[model samples]
Target: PPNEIYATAQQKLQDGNWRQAITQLEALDNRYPFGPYSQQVQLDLIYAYYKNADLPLAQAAIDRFIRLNPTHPNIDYVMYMRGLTNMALDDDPQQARAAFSDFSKLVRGYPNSQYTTDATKRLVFLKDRLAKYEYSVAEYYTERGAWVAVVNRVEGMLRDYPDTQATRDALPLMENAYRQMQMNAQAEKVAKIIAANSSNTLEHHHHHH
Candidate 1:
């Protein structure tokens, strides 16, 4: 009920004992299901997973937290963690989109948290990640001789992360892929995804981008 796990977890997290902190917080969550510290444990567990380099687990945990406590007072923390989870996962667009969607939703609904400033920063980061994700998909197809897929993917990236280096790199590759595939219809339609997502493109855009 007191702030037992919080202090220890914070200490452990700062000390780079992410694995240990995760264990501690998870134990706290299970042992003191309804304790005053339960919420904090849940929150810290998300970070612990991230710090421990367990990105997917962190994403799963944070998603659960936000879904269960949509109206919690520290919702910004949830939003931030969700953003970090996406970032940790190589800036994966599908994942960033999920986290950013929630983060943006909460930001719109609430006043400001001291944490919102960082959250705002992450929104921009998510957009970049989305753009890269698009380009990477296109590049993958291009490399594999999937010209139609490349065209579509790059177009999607251009739409999503427009006006970026990735867009420039992606277009050439997409054109090449299109030439290889000879899928005229697909090459024509490929850019539509880019237009719809409002992001950028890349020849080798990836989650890490």
Candidate 2:
């Protein structure tokens, strides 16, 4: 019954009346907490807030969804949305970590969710961002003789993400840091792999035309 009212709200949302849709959806939730449309209202409210760039409000709705239905059919979408919203907000490393935590849990816990394929792709995208962030931090630390921090950052890059262009680029920096820290063996090993891969990638692209 109330879901149709939400349909009207959805119409408003699609029509770009985001603020009005927010009011209507919130009212629907307040007036019918246990109604058949409660869950849907909650979901729509979250999406509306996200579409409107009300990130904190969107996050609140996401939190509620996780609390109430941690095992929902499309739980991965919530996690993906968290990652997407946090990224859109230009969140710091700490905020990115929270998003990563949700994504990591989803990828680990349910490798077969409806949104798994999309989540998998997004994870790669996120990982590349993460790799760049960590690599920059590692370079900063390495220049200060902060060997422990450098190593930790490089390890974090490798541990948290699959390899990509960012990771490949970071490998040289990581190897150099290892060299400066007297980790000769590790540096040589990484250097060779990086050089070989770089050459191969360049060659592949050169003949790509």
For each of the candidates, the C-alpha root-mean-square deviation to the true structure, in angstroms, is 7.7, 5.5
* Per-model lDDT: 0.70, 0.75
Score candidate 2 by lDDT.
0.75
Q: What TM-scores do the predictions have?
A: 0.58, 0.77
How many clashes (backbone atoms < 3 Å, residues ≥3 apart in a chain or on different chains) does model 2 have? 0
> Measured by TM-score, how close is model 1 to the native structure?
0.58
lDDT of 2 by residue, 161-197 (tens): 5366666666767787788878999889877867666
Q: How many backbone clashes does candidate 1 have?
A: 19
Candidate 1 C-alpha lDDT tens digits along 9-127? 77998898988888778878888877776777888788788878798888788778778887898777777777667756644246678766766765666535566566666766776
TM-score of 2: 0.77
Q: How many angstroms is residue 79 displaced in model 2 relative to the true structure, after the best TM-score fit? A: 2.3
Off by over 4 Å in 1: 1-7, 91-93, 99-103, 106-111, 132-209
